[PDB]
Ligand binder design. Structure first.
Ligand code: ET
Ligand code: ET
Ligand code: NI
Ligand code: NI
Lengths: 172, 173
């Protein structure tokens, strides 16, 4: 209800101000509601942060939801992944940056650990179901390193590189 | 050029980030740590981004210090994946104060353009060693998967499995 009107205000405030610009006052302003209602639904910011990311996590589903080849016996997995991956990182990255920002905030924010471990959740499940539970962790580990390389160092996205390295891990 | 005060300024910035992270990192915070004035801390590093860039590059020079400490990484016979996975399990030796603060600096670039240059030097230490012992493309993935394997452990309190890390790294060779 309001948790919603105020949650989208958190993703809008991080996307814009980055975590550092997120405070109850900060979101209460976006959501356009009283300071006491923001504080009500979310006692601490860590809660209003898991809310934010737990909702973001969804988006990843909707995505796999849209591409069938991912759950398809053949197609590929690697080509499909490299492909769709270049999409999410395509052009304006205000979305991925807020998502990664939060997810990585689990480095020093304990409350944010459980949600963080629910990252690839939207594929980590699928991959281990398509392959094994050692290749699942693997693939998500390559994706992370591959995505961190682009976002943190200005290196452009190399889809063939990624489509190339993803295969090596996935056995036959 | 007032070098020693500046050394202890960068020395405190790391201490600060290690026990308080970036959240509690700023001129007042570092100046109080190094025990320097403050206009001294701002004198050497105009922006915070400046000190962060600095702190990072100094800690990250230890990576080149270990790659040297294990010549076996170059032995063209030696199993790189295993050696790579072992020295890594070493860097992760408990209460990763070293690791946690470096990566936090490394990852801060996500939203700070100024930190993107040092963020490009994160795996510079093993650079010549990976170019000469594999290929440029296999080379990038080792890093990508090393950073990936590292996030799982730091971001989710799950423990490092060198044995799992040697298989993954191998699968790419
Ligand atoms: C959860 C982030 N994440 C990952 C991802 C990155 C690193 C490790 C695991 C998954 C991803 C990976 C591939 N190949 C293709 C699309 C996405 C994606 C798409 C949308 C979104 N909103 C988050 C997304
Ligand atoms: C620069 C961080 N880093 C990496 C590393 C982590 C992820 C990607 C690339 C390199 C590393 C990787 C291996 N195998 C062995 C030791 C280290 C290491 C040792 C010390 C340090 N201070 C930073 C270190
Ligand atoms: Ni598509
Ligand atoms: Ni050693």
């Amino acid at each position: 209800e309001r948790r919603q009107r105020i949650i989208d205000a958190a993703i809008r405030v991080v996307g814009q101000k980055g975590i550092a610009g997120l405070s109850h006052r900060t979101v209460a302003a976006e959501a356009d509601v009283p300071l006491g209602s923001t504080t009500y639904h979310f006692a601490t910011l860590d809660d209003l942060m898991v809310a934010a990311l737990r909702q973001a996590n969804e988006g990843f589903a909707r995505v796999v939801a849209a591409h069938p080849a991912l759950s398809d016996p053949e197609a590929d997995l690697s080509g499909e992944l490299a492909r769709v991956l270049g999409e999410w990182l395509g052009g304006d990255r205000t979305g991925v940056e807020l998502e990664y920002e939060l997810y990585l905030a689990a480095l020093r924010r304990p409350a944010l650990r459980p949600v963080a471990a629910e990252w690839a959740e939207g594929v980590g499940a699928l991959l281990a179901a398509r392959t094994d539970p050692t290749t699942a962790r693997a693939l998500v580990a390559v994706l992370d390193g591959i995505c961190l390389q682009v976002l943190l160092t200005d290196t452009p996205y190399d889809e063939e590189y990624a489509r190339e390295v993803l295969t090596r891990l996935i056995p036959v």
